[PDB]
Every structure is written in C-alpha cells, then in structure tokens.
Design a protein around this ligand. Structure first.
Ligand code: HEM
Length: 394
C-alpha cells in the first residue's frame, strides 16, 4: 500500500486507485518535485472537472513538446524535427486530422467487425476446449493488431508479418530496429501502391488527397509517421481494456447476470469498462502560459500530467460508487479517449472490439475464473495493460 504519488510500474499497476483518491481529495493540482531531479518538476491533475477542461484547452495545454513528464522526450525518441499527429497543436494538427479522419467512419468499423468476431470465436473456443489458458497471448494481444492493420489498409495476407513488427514495437514502446525498418519499408511500398490502387482506408485517403504527391518527401514521411502512431496507439491500449476488464467482470457475477439476461445492455457495459480500465491512465501536456486552477498556479513551461484514470474515477462526477462496476451506469464524459482536438480516432474501433469480446466471453465461456493477484502488468507509466491474465474455463 502507498497513497503517495509516483509514476506507476508493473509492480504498482494492480491498485493505483487509493493514490488517485488521495490526490483528488487532498491535492487536486499536485506539484511533483523528484528529489533526485528537482529540475524535472511537473504537475498532476486528478479531478474530472480539471482534466476535462485541460484536455479541451489545447491553447493553454500544448501537446507539441511531448506527452510524458520527461523534458527530454522528443530528442530521446528522435521526433523533435517533425513530431507525430498526437504531438501537434492546431492549426498544424487540424488539416492532417481532417484528411486521416476520412478513414475513420462507420464504414471502416463495420467492415472489420465480422473478421474480429470470427477471430474472437476461434480463440475463445480453443481456450474453452483446453479449460482455459493464456487469453492475453492468444486473443487480447493479436486481436487489436489485426484491427490496426485494417485501418492502415494492410492486405489480410500480410497481417501475420505485420503482427511480428507490431509486437516488437509495442514491447519497445512500453529499440525495435528490425521492426521499424521492416515496417517503414513495407509502407513505402504500400503508399506507392495506393497512388494507383486506392481503397477506403486512412493511408489510401492521405495518398488520394495528395499528401506526398509531386516529390513531397515530407508529406510521405508524415504518412509513415502516422503508421507508427497507429501501431503505438491502437494495440497496448485495447489489450489493456480487454485484459483489465477480466477481473472486474469476474468478481461481479450480478453484473455478468444482467448481461447474460439482456445482451442488449452490452454497449453500455463497454462504456463502464472503458471508464474503469482507462488503459491510457495519463498523458502529459506543456503549459504555454501561467494558469491558475483553484489555489495553485502552474507556471508556463512545465509538464502537466492529465490523470484520465483518476478523472474517470472521480466521485464528484460519478458519485460515491465511482470505484464500483455498474454496467447500467451509462457514464458520460468519460476521459478514456481524452476530449477535444486529439479525441481518440480509434474510439469506435476500440468500442467494437470490447463489445464483440464481451458478447462472446459471456456466450461461449460464461463459467470462468480469473486470479487477479496473479495478473502480470506491463511496465511503463502511461498505459495500464496486462501481459498475462490467468484464465480458467469450466
Ligand atoms: C481502448 C483502447 C484505446 C484507448 C484507451 C485510446 C486512448 C487514446 C487517447 C487518450 C488519445 C489522446 C492522446 C492524448 O490525450 O494526447 C488517443 C489518440 C489516438 N488514438 Fe486511441 N485509444 C485506444 C484505441 C485506439 C485504436 C484502436 C486506434 C486505431 C484504430 C487508435 C488511434 C488513435 C490515434 C491515431 C490517436 C491520435 C489522435 C490525434 O492526436 O488527433 N486508438 N487514443
């Protein structure tokens, strides 16, 4: 047990909630001054109201210096020259987002759903036949990779090779030189193909809109950067949502009962699971001006950690039962996908995967066991996701 603020590790991901509660109740605008590195001080926002408003306010809370509390981030990763879309502010962010958004419509979520369902069924049946097993390795890891592949217009025949690169990158993001090289090489070819054979995906749309046309190397690089953004955005997060939901469901048979009796309640249940798992538990911003929130003034030029995971658990927004699973809650203004300019492009895709996985878990493996104490969590301070979830089926 610890109620003192610290960036999470594999060992402290099981139960960050009391720490968050202490912040919300006693220091909602919390100044962190690392004793070993006081020059790397930063601030932490834990309440729903403050996080909601800060996420929206890109003018005051910029994404352009990076999304971690590490002040050397952009040079450390090698993206200072031209940061990716998630590290762009408007207006730079706006045009590119408009173009790629053409590949994030109901059509793209709908076309991949039968493929998602088929894979979920295949893997859950294998688990059922074997009385359980490694649900993360066999389902919750590979599934989101296929969906990201779909959104990038990777042909189905290349999904296995694409999974290989994805896993190396995801593990490293939590070097991957072979993977980064293979992927950037593969997409160079695919982008070229989309010049003459455009489909309905985000890459096809970027190419059709003339990004990279007429020797615009920088444009082409932006498409390549977007592929890396997608791999890092759409994988560990979904695995976190899926794996993180398992103990929550297991320990509430009454809540499973509600959905067994009314499967049409599953979409609402997905929102509640997204609220409580909040796979992106926090991301940072940089203040562009001094800003006062209550009795605290955050100086210009400092990182501010937006604790989405805490905002999602704030009793001021969701009541004294905010810590509990209620699949009929219908929570509004969840922070799981942030809010404002950078609102997750993959929200509908993530929701669809959760819906299909939950539907089939209840239909195919209703009697299951999860030992929460034996879950292994990934390292990394921003995304909360299991590497392994003990899973037994009777
Ligand atoms: C449950 C799973 C997911 C969670 C919790 C999640 C969370 C988020 C969050 C919090 C942001 C905003 C980042 C910020 O505040 O700076 C974001 C952005 C983004 N996400 Fe997701 N995401 C998920 C799944 C996905 C999927 C499946 C995809 C792709 C199909 C995706 C693609 C993106 C992209 C491209 C952005 C950048 C948007 C922009 O900066 O304008 N995400 N996501």
């Amino acid at each position: 047990m610890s109620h003192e603020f610290q960036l999470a590790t594999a060992e402290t991901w099981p139960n960050p909630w009391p720490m968050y509660r202490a912040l919300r109740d006693h220091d909602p605008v919390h100044h962190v001054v690392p004793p070993q590195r006081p020059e790397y001080d930063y601030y932490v926002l834990s309440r729903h109201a403050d996080v909601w408003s800060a996420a929206r306010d890109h003018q005051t809370f910029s994404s352009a210096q990076g999304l971690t509390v590490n002040y050397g981030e952009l040079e450390m990763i090698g993206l200072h020259d031209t940061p990716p879309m998630v590290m762009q502010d408007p207006p730079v962010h706006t045009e590119f987002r408009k173009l790629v958004s053409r590949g994030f419509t109901p059509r793209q979520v709908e076309t991949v759903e039968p493929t998602v369902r088929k894979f979920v069924v295949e893997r859950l049946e294998k688990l059922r036949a074997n009385g359980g097993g490694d649900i993360v390795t066999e389902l919750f890891k590979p599934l989101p990779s296929m969906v990201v592949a779909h959104y990038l217009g990777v042909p189905e025949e290349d999904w296995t090779q694409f999974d290989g690169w994805t896993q190396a990158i995801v593990a490293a993001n939590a070097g991957a030189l072979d993977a980064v090289g293979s992927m950037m090489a593969y997409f160079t070819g695919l982008i070229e193909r989309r010049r003459t054979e455009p489909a309905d995906d985000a890459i096809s749309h970027l190419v059709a809109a003339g990004v990279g046309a007429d020797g615009d190397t920088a444009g082409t690089l932006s498409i390549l950067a977007f592929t890396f953004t997608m791999v890092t955005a759409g994988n560990d997060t979904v695995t976190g949502m899926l794996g993180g939901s398992m103990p929550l469901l297991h320990r509430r048979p009454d809540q499973r009962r509600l959905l067994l009796d009314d499967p049409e309640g599953i979409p609402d249940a997905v929102e509640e699971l997204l609220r409580l798992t909040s796979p992106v538990q926090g991301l940072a911003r940089t203040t562009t001006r001094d800003v006062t929130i209550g009795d605290t003034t955050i100086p210009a030029g400092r990182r501010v950690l937006l604790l989405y995971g805490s905002a999602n658990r704030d009793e001021r927004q969701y009541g004294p039962d905010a810590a509990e699973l209620d699949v009929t809650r219908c929570p509004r203004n969840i922070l799981t996908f942030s809010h404002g300019a950078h609102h997750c492009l993959g929200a509908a895709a993530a929701r669809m995967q959760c819906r299909v996985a939950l539907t089939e878990l209840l239909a195919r493996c209703p009697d299951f066991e999860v030992a929460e104490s034996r879950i292994v969590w990934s390292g990394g301070s921003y995304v909360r996701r299991p590497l392994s979830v003990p899973f037994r089926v009777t």
